[PDB]
């Protein structure tokens, strides 16, 4: 809630990724709970925007660090994929597809129903 209500400022998002990376280092089970609290929105929007903006080294490094720590337990990767295609956030579904996912988990039906983007269908 702190990261989402402050999804634009720099110090909050950077230090928030730092604290989340710290707790995720201390406990790996604090990832399913995180995405249960809809962790997907902050990580997707920030990882999209930081590449869209000036790509800082260390900020994006912490970004992919916590994203790697949540990338395990591929059931969570699948629900992250489902929430990613629930939006038209094509880059992140492309990333999760390169990482590991399945359109046969339907998903093509969901992408055809809700007026989605052609690059997402491709």
Compute, in degrees rounded to 10, the torsion defined by CA atoms 79, 120, 8, 100.
40
Query: Which tokens is 38 given?
Result: 């809809």
- The DSSP symbol for 122 reads -
Query: Which tokens is 87 given?
Result: 């939006």
Cα–Cα dist 84/76, whole Å = 12
Resolution as reported, in Å: 4.0
Count of positions (residues) in the chain: 122
Question: Could you tell me which residues come within 8 angstroms of residue 101 by beta carbon, excluding any fewer than 6 positions away?
Answer: 77, 78, 81, 93
């Amino acid at each position: 809630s702190s990261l989402y209500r402050f999804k634009d400022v720099a110090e909050i998002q950077t230090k928030g990724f730092q604290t989340i990376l710290a707790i995720l280092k201390l406990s790996a089970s604090f990832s399913k709970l995180l995405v249960h609290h809809s962790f997907d929105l902050v990580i997707f929007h920030q990882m999209s925007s930081n590449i869209m903006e000036q790509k800082d080294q260390q900020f994006l490094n912490l970004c992919c660090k916590c994203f790697a720590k949540v990338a395990m337990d591929d059931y969570l990767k699948n629900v992250m994929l489902e929430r990613a295609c629930d939006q038209n956030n094509s880059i992140m579904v492309e990333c999760l597809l390169l990482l590991g996912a399945d359109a046969n988990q339907s998903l093509i039906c969901q992408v055809c129903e809700k007026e989605s983007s052609p690059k997402l269908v491709e």
